[PDB]
Design a protein around this ligand. Structure first.
Ligand SMILES: Cc1cc2nc3c(=O)[nH]c(=O)nc-3n(C[C@H](O)[C@H](O)[C@H](O)COP(=O)(O)OP(=O)(O)OC[C@H]3O[C@@H](n4cnc5c(N)ncnc54)[C@H](O)[C@@H]3O)c2cc1C
Ligand SMILES: Cc1cc2nc3c(=O)[nH]c(=O)nc-3n(C[C@H](O)[C@H](O)[C@H](O)COP(=O)(O)OP(=O)(O)OC[C@H]3O[C@@H](n4cnc5c(N)ncnc54)[C@H](O)[C@@H]3O)c2cc1C
Ligand SMILES: [Cl-]
Ligand SMILES: [Cl-]
Lengths: 543, 555
């Protein structure tokens, strides 16, 4: 649960997650996740092979450049550090498909020169002051799970780049049971956070799909969103307090009030700042008693549009359960192919549901939901089919490394949009992808899929998967990366946002000024130029 | 509900609200509000005089030019070409030279302002605002935007040593609903529309915002966004920062707006939060998209009495812990309970003055939404309450407390005719500090007054007015009879500063909703750290580099 210093002992240098977990074919020729870590671990998936085959038409380093008298002064603090190639390479990237290619195939252009491992707030203060004194460049890293190029080192950064690794700065500092808050160190992962809260009878309920590795500091930095936000809030509702070390000095409010009116909220200057302003070291987060009961469910709809209209109605009545998701037909069948052991089934769409709270309330709420669904032609599809798409939630990123071994490339991307744009966006965006792949010479129709993943009063988060069999293609990355950018253009033309939770990093920089206005961009820059005049925090995300 | 241009035709020039609405003594010597505007209007309040006498020690017998307009003639020339409506009349300028602080109100009654705006403009749309801002760059002018003029933090006071021509940029003619989107449940509005007129207009469509601050008859969308306003039913509808989905802001550097109308994004720090709470320092909010909701099918009032205030707080804490706070829940201390009881129709005899009626606190409750849910919910709340000693005090006591809300501000003016000065002030605090903060702040107040030579013990009262997961908003009221005190405004001002210091030392914030204005400037840096303060200043220096927006709030 604590990320160890040498990450490659536990985690894959060249892909997602733990060394001991990959898809392989078992002794019966069926796909299976190796290892003992998950629910799905060791569970044969008899129809997954057949699904992959039908869907995709397949069968089956630079030296360290670091100052000698900086290094000297660092030796004084006994802060742990490393200049080893694997250590720097492990931290030179996140989890974009571009990045995960290179790794396996070539080498990166720039990697950190030196990794540092602070264990507390004061360590981070010292590091930041050394960086000021000796003109060095810092890139913070927590889980390393960025999907937005947020950790890529600018290839023209000629300063020494410090990788400031927050993974040893990872304690629950205090739990305040009267105020239901917990003060934690920013390097704690979501797993280690919940596991510890759970022993006192509390949780945070913040469940991004990367919680095994993503950290509190990361969440704040990227404006992270979790599967159960309908109950617990997204990151900007969970955080009541934070402490940030910048070159200019330390940021922190003096009181733990729940809500204030003392000028523009400075917390909001830091959430989303994507590593560009300083290091978030500590944060206070709301907690909640561990829910009494959990119930899964699912609903089948005659088509995707009926499903969307139902999710709209559920949001309009303000009775979304802990989680509700609507998959289109493709993503359904994906799902249904992964089972252990009326309607037209080619347009048929499926919502999955998660209820949690008092057992009394769950089954009451559940009934209100299926009654609403029934007005749209919804029909209960059973708890097991619901319980699946959610026990399957944390495997999906192991699947990418399995596609790559068979010449399949895919990646996800997401947006949020007002309710009245959701249907046209899904359609036009899934169709632009298909159009671009054919025009770029992809030989097989891509996987082009969407789901509705979060509901809000004023609209929805939409999630896309895109993948294709690249064989016979000259330059597969370029095609892919051109098709993704075209999908983004389709997204923005259909009134969707630049991003709902992934952030901007360096992947989506080119669209920011248009998204937030020129003066908006100027405002961000003006904070940057004040907090960090000498651009110590030089990952160049956002701006 | 639209503010017409010459406000003093309708509103008091020297205090709260409407001309037609003030307290007076009726033909049988009972206090009574004039006019026909409120539910209490024209209703004799037979025990209100007694309560005032018991509480303040007065009889209720003993009662109690402008700077020239300096404006560049060329500016004026270009201003006429735009056909934007304007005034240099002294009463338009003085009306817009203040908000509703005691201190301001007092000068109004007793003297003249040091500095008042030099010209009042009334833009009717966004492009008018762009024009004005451009004219202020060109002619080196200062702009102070005003909506309702209901600020209570000095937010509208013109700094005395501002030497540039000051435009009072009044937004009240900028008041249309531009579209109501029933698909997305949003409404796009001009920022000068009042709470009253917004809700009246949405209601005709079957919708509401449910944003209900006590100043809603006058306060504006732009105002709310500027001050980070909180309304009475936030538990259901959210505070301003939850309600606003979109905004357009004209600043000297250009116009801020996002390019989409999505519910939630991750595109860097959220610039909407750079403008929320900006108190007129950065530019003009011209238009906003706000969430709306179907008009609630059903409302119910209720009330609960508790053995004491502590028990009341523990119950609110539990209700918040179970996440079942209704539309509105407010807990009043014994003094406020007694106050409310004195606002009732039965006429007492002049020869008369298991719960103790002098420690007992009362929670007022509002539930709204679907009949079925309301009712279920109401049960759940009383079931909880009953474990803290709570007894139902009846639907009429709840209804009264909430009907009373919009008249309390007319009592301040009544107080002032009889030598009583009073002012409210608020904070937010974690749960575990609430009971102590209330006990200590009230006791600081009573000690400062006595030390300052106040004769009769002051009214010092609180209520817990909002619940959150992490804490509560606490609202205080403070008043005393100043009669026979030398410099009464000084004694008052210093006692309020002392109370603020007690608040901060008991783990409370600088403000929950009133904001910082010019009144709390000295505490801000400590509140947000120096670097925090520094970031604010850098956005100010970038968006308004010549300080056109010169009201000098916050920084
Ligand atoms: C398989 C997978 C599933 C995912 N699921 C979700 C999801 O459900 N919801 C969601 O929101 N995201 C999701 N993400 C994206 C990602 O996990 C989040 O953006 C997460 O917040 C990043 O946290 P991290 O600790 O891994 O940060 P990192 O990847 O280490 O860094 C993220 C950015 O923040 C900066 N940073 C990191 N720590 C600090 C610090 N303490 N101080 C200052 N800056 C810092 C870095 O410089 C970088 O720019 C997913 C990603 C993957 C690969
Ligand atoms: C009796 C009474 C009850 C109150 N109750 C509450 C309450 O329940 N909740 C609460 O939060 N507040 C309350 N207040 C405080 C006040 O009404 C709120 O702060 C409200 O938001 C102010 O709105 P307004 O339109 O009157 O703004 P104004 O007083 O006109 O201006 C407020 C500030 O915003 C700036 N400003 C105004 N319009 C714009 C604009 N369009 N663009 C940029 N800047 C602008 C002004 O320069 C000023 O600094 C109350 C006040 C009184 C007197
Ligand atoms: Cl994700
Ligand atoms: Cl108020």
């Amino acid at each position: 649960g604590i990320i160890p210093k040498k990450r490659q002992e536990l985690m894959k240098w060249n892909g997602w997650g733990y060394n001991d977990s990959k898809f392989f074919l078992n002794k019966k020729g069926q796909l299976e996740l190796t290892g003992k870590r998950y629910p799905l671990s060791g569970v044969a998936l008899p129809t997954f092979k057949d699904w992959i085959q039908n869907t995709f038409g397949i069968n089956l380093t630079p030296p360290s450049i670091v100052n000698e008298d900086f290094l000297h002064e660092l030796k004084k603090t006994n802060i742990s550090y490393s200049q080893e190639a694997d250590d720097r390479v492990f931290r030179a990237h996140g989890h974009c498909l571009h990045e995960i290619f290179l790794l396996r195939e070539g080498m990166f252009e720039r990697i950190p020169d030196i990794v540092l491992w602070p264990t507390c707030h004061d360590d981070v203060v010292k590091i930041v002051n050394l960086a000021c004194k000796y003109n060095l460049c810092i890139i913070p890293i927590g889980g390393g799970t960025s999907v937005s190029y947020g950790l890529m080192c600018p290839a023209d950064e000629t300063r020494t780049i410090i990788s400031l690794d927050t993974s040893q700065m990872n304690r629950i500092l205090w739990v305040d049971e009267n105020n239901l808050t917990a003060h934690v160190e920013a390097g704690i992962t979501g797993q280690e956070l919940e596991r510890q809260l759970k022993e006192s009878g509390y949780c945070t309920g913040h469940e991004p799909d990367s919680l095994e590795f993503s950290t509190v500091g990361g969440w704040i930095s990227t404006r992270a969103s979790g599967m159960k936000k309908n109950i617990y809030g997204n990151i900007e509702d969970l955080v009541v307090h934070m402490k940030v070390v910048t070159p200019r000095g330390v940021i922190e409010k003096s009181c733990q009030g729940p809500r204030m009116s003392t000028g523009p909220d400075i917390h909001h200057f830091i959430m989303g700042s994507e590593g560009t302003l300083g290091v978030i070291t500590e944060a206070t987060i709301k907690i909640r008693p561990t829910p009494e009961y959990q119930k899964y469910g699912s609903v089948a709809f005659p088509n995707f549009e009926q499903g969307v209209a139902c999710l709209r109605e559920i949001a309009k009545q303000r009775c979304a359960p802990a989680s509700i998701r609507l998959m289109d037909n493709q993503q359904f069948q994906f799902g249904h192919a992964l089972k252990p052991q009326g309607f037209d089934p080619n347009q048929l769409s499926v919502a999955t549901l998660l209820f949690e709270g008092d057992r009394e309330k769950v089954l009451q709420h559940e009934k209100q939901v299926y009654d609403i669904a029934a007005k749209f032609g919804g029909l209960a599809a059973g708890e097991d089919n619901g319980q699946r798409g959610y026990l399957l939630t944390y495997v999906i990123a192991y699947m990418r490394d399995l596609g790559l071994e068979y010449y399949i490339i895919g990646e996800s991307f997401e947006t949020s949009a007002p309710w009245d744009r959701v249907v046209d966006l899904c359609r036009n965006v899934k169709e632009r992808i298909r159009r671009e792949c054919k025009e770029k010479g992809v030989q097989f129709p891509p996987l082009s899929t969407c789901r509705v993943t979060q509901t809000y009063d004023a609209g929805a988060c939409i999630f896309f998967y895109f993948a294709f069999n690249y064989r016979g293609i000259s330059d597969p990355l370029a095609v892919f990366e051109q098709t993704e950018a075209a999908a983004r253009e389709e997204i923005l033309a259909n009134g969707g946002s630049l991003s709902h939770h992934h952030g901007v990093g360096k992947l989506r920089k080119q669209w920011l000024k248009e998204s937030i206005s020129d003066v908006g961009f100027g405002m961000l820059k003006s904070v940057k130029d004040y907090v960090d005049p000498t651009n110590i925090f030089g990952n160049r995300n956002l701006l």
